[PDB]
Amino acid sequence: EDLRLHLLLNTSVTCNDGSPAGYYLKESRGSRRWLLFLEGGWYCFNRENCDSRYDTMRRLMSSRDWPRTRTGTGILSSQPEENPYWWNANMVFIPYCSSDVWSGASSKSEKNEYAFMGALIIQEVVRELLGRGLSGAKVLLLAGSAAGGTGVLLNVDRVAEQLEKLGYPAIQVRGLADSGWFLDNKQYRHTDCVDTITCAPTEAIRRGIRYWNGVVPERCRRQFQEGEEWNCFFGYKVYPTLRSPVFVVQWLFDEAQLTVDNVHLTGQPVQEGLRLYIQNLGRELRHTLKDVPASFAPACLSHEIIIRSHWTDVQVKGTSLPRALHCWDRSLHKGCPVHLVDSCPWPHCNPSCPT
Amino acid sequence: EDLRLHLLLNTSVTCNDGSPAGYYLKESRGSRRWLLFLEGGWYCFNRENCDSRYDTMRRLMSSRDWPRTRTGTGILSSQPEENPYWWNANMVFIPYCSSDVWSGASSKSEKNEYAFMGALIIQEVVRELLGRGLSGAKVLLLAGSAAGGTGVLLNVDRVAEQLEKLGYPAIQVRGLADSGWFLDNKQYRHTDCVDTITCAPTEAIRRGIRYWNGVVPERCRRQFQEGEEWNCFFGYKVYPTLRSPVFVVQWLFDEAQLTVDNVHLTGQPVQEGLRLYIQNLGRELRHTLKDVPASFAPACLSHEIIIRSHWTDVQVKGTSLPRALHCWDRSLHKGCPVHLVDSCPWPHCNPSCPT
Numbered sequence: 001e002d003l004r005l006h007l008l009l010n011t012s013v014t015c016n017d018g019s020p021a022g023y024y025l026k027e028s029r030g031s032r033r034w035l036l037f038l039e040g041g042w043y044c045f046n047r048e049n050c051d052s053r054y055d056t057m058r059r060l061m062s063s064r065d066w067p068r069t070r071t072g073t074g075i076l077s078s079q080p081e082e083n084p085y086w087w088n089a090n091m092v093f094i095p096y097c098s099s100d101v102w103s104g105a106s107s108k109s110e111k112n113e114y115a116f117m118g119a120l121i122i123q124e125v126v127r128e129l130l131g132r133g134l135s136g137a138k139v140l141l142l143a144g145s146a147a148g149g150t151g152v153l154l155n156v157d158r159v160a161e162q163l164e165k166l167g168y169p170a171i172q173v174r175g176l177a178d179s180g181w182f183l184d185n186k187q188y189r190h191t192d193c194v195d196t197i198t199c200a201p202t203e204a205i206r207r208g209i210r211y212w213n214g215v216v217p218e219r220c221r222r223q224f225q226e227g228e229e230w231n232c233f234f235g236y237k238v239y240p241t242l243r244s245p246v247f248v249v250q251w252l253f254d255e256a257q258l259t260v261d262n263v264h265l266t267g268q269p270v271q272e273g274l275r276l277y278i279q280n281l282g283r284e285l286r287h288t289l290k291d292v293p294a295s296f297a298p299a300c301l302s303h304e305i306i307i308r309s310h311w312t313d314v315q316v317k318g319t320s321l322p323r324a325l326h327c328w329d330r331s332l333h334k335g336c337p338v339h340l341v342d343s344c345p346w347p348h349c350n351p352s353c354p355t
Numbered sequence: 356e357d358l359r360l361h362l363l364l365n366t367s368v369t370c371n372d373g374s375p376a377g378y379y380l381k382e383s384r385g386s387r388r389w390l391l392f393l394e395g396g397w398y399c400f401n402r403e404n405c406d407s408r409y410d411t412m413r414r415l416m417s418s419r420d421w422p423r424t425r426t427g428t429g430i431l432s433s434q435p436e437e438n439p440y441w442w443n444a445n446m447v448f449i450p451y452c453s454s455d456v457w458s459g460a461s462s463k464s465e466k467n468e469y470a471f472m473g474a475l476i477i478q479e480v481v482r483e484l485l486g487r488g489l490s491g492a493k494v495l496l497l498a499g500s501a502a503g504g505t506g507v508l509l510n511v512d513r514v515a516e517q518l519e520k521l522g523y524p525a526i527q528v529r530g531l532a533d534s535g536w537f538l539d540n541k542q543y544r545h546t547d548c549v550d551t552i553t554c555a556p557t558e559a560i561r562r563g564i565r566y567w568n569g570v571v572p573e574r575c576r577r578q579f580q581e582g583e584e585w586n587c588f589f590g591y592k593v594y595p596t597l598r599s600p601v602f603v604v605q606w607l608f609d610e611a612q613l614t615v616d617n618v619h620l621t622g623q624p625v626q627e628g629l630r631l632y633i634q635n636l637g638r639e640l641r642h643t644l645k646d647v648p649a650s651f652a653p654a655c656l657s658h659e660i661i662i663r664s665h666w667t668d669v670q671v672k673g674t675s676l677p678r679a680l681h682c683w684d685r686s687l688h689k690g691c692p693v694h695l696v697d698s699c700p701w702p703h704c705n706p707s708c709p710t
């Protein structure tokens with residue numbers, strides 16, 4: 001009933017500490033649909049901060065204590081009531097143990113404590129799954145939440161290419177990026193960049209990319225000058241050059257965006273300046289989605305949705321996320337919308353927001 | 356949420372008493388799948404017996420008191436937990452008001468009290484649905500239980516032809532016949548044919564066909580001599596010449612078959628002769644399904660299944676009916692069986708039978 005853990009067979013490809021990376025799998029032999037989900041969980045952008053992460057959030061840097069099984073939730077649930085359209089898919093959860101926003105593509109240097117291999121983890125999972133049924137797939141949906149969402153944007157075209165090169169051109173590779181669409185904006189009030197809470201988005205990725213030896217998609221890399229590849233971690237910059245179809249799910253007021261912007265909305269009264277900052281951030285997010293054909297962007301203050309059990313409950317313009325996703329799937333193959341962006345100005349202006 | 360009643364616009368096509376026939380409809384604009392379900396409810400084969408039926412089961416002869424709405428159940432449910440694969444289909448329930456096993460194709464004669472138009476009801480429903488979305492369909496599944504099941508066998512190729520003639524050759528017409536697969540066998544002990552309870556199966560249909568002016572499929576009609584069209588109401592005789600794919604669901608020990616065979620199994624001890632009769636009936640039913648590629652035939656004493664809420668619960672050889680149906684749908688488009696026939700000798704030898 002649960003997804004079962006498999007540790008990768010390729011010993012070169014590891015979590016930060018060198019323990020084997022892996023994936024959880026629940027096979028569904030009556031379906032040709034595969035859902036490959038990339039876990040989120042922030043990042044670390046220097047050795048001091050990765051050392052702290054290792055001490056406090058070891059599961060995000062090591063496979064040593066991963067459980068043998070995981071129950072799928074939300075889009076990974078095999079229960080029809082929880083996942084009405086896609087419950088019968090082949091379900092894969094790839095734990096995030098690379099701290100690199102799934103962008104690392106090099107073996108560890110002798111001058112590093114940690115290895116940053118997230119892009120290679122994805123590649124190796126895909127290769128091992130080919131011997132487990134993925135060879136027969138019709139659709140491979142690379143999905144992800146938060147850092148995993150950004151990971152989808154960074155890896156979907158790599159995966160697409162990989163399957164073609166390996167001899168499986170009929171598998172349709174698509175992406176689903178949830179809560180991974182950020183603005184490289186100015187903080188409301190500044191804090192010096194010392195950790196992931198205090199570091200403005202541009203600065204965090206400029207530092208991170210270098211530390212991780214992170215790679216970005218080739219089609220986006222071209223658009224920016226040498227040393228300016230950090231741009232490609234920002235959805236509105238990377239999205240227009242993608243080859244693969246990607247559906248974008250994004251809360252207009254994402255809690256992680258607010259955190260790195262040094263805004264904390266807790267149900268307190270706010271001053272006009274903060275009001276304006278927050279309203280403008282929602283407008284800016286809307287602006288970036290105007291030409292994204294397949295999107296779901298409710299006016300709520302939240303973070304992540306697709307593996308949450310109550311992902312069926314939020315609606316935009318009268319339509320749920322699972323339905324919008326189904327409509328998109330059909331469009332890629334009347335009364336079935338795929339572009340669903342709220343336009344009201346403040347979080348919870350949509351009555352269906354999670355509470 | 357419910358299916359809503361529509362009375363047919365074609366005034367020539369009526370229930371037994373001349374009231375308008377009709378259909379219940381729940382549209383699902385995000386699906387190209389249509390389920391058209393034919394209700395069962397025995398038959399009447401002369402005026403005396405139809406008069407009694409009118410007095411005691413008027414709903415089966417008249418639309419006068421039909422409710423404005425009906426909740427879909429089983430395969431007609433829009434609830435994922437109840438109908439895991441096909442909950443999102445366009446749902447149509449066609450009430451049985453013709454008492455003719457859906458075989459009547461003539462206007463009423465002035466020498467009759469009742470009109471027998473069941474084949475024409477189906478045709479007229481299909482024509483009216485074309486203006487309601489069916490024009491866009493990918494799959495039209497003509498399904499039915501008991502008399503409706505036999506109705507599927509009698510009408511599926513007519514429907515197929517009809518859609519082609521009307522200019523919609525891309526719609527894939529298929530059938531699902533539940534509890535409509537009977538043997539034209541000898542009664543265990545004889546009773547004179549005076550009503551539907553006492554009349555042996557051959558005699559019932561020989562009488563009925565004539566009374567109804569019933570029509571049978573052309574491909575089967577050819578196989579039998581003039582006046583021997585009654586043969587075509589028996590699945591094992593009509594099935595081999597069908598053009599359309601038909602999935603057959605049949606309890607090995609169908610309660611209606613036993614009734615017309617003058618057997619009543621109620622959990623009492625039975626004599627060896629009755630034991631042998633019942634065992635042979637199961638063997639015979641098995642024999643008739645050996646070359647039916649898509650079938651689900653559990654060793655249970657029951658009648659009907661596909662619109663029952665607990666249709667998900669019975670299993671044969673480890674597989675449920677909704678799954679077998681999904682596997683068949685995929686086959687028509689490994690680890691996905693479609694031919695599922697029990698081989699044990701007595702009802703309830705399958706532990707999953709309904710209780």
Ligand SMILES: *[C@@H]1O[C@H](CO)[C@@H](O)[C@H](O)[C@H]1NC(C)=O
Pocket residue numbers: 010012013120121123124127
């Ligand atoms: C092992 O992983 C590395 C990096 O992803 C890759 O280049 C190599 O092809 C893999 N080896 C095998 C045998 O799959």
Ligand SMILES: *[C@@H]1O[C@H](CO)[C@@H](O)[C@H](O)[C@H]1NC(C)=O
Pocket residue numbers: 365367368475476478479482
């Ligand atoms: C009315 O129904 C009759 C019998 O089914 C049929 O022959 C005729 O074509 C129908 N008329 C219309 C206008 O659909």
Ligand SMILES: [Cl-]
Pocket residue numbers: 029030031088678681691
């Ligand atoms: Cl299945």
Ligand SMILES: [Cl-]
Pocket residue numbers: 046047050111112113114
């Ligand atoms: Cl390091």
Ligand SMILES: [Cl-]
Pocket residue numbers: 323326336384385386443
């Ligand atoms: Cl839909």
Ligand SMILES: [Cl-]
Pocket residue numbers: 401402405466467468469
């Ligand atoms: Cl009559």
Ligand code: NA
Pocket residue numbers: 197198199258259260261262263
């Ligand atoms: Na902050």
Ligand code: NA
Pocket residue numbers: 341342343344
């Ligand atoms: Na709006």
Ligand code: NA
Pocket residue numbers: 552553554613614615616617618
């Ligand atoms: Na009887």
Ligand code: NA
Pocket residue numbers: 696697698699
């Ligand atoms: Na068996």
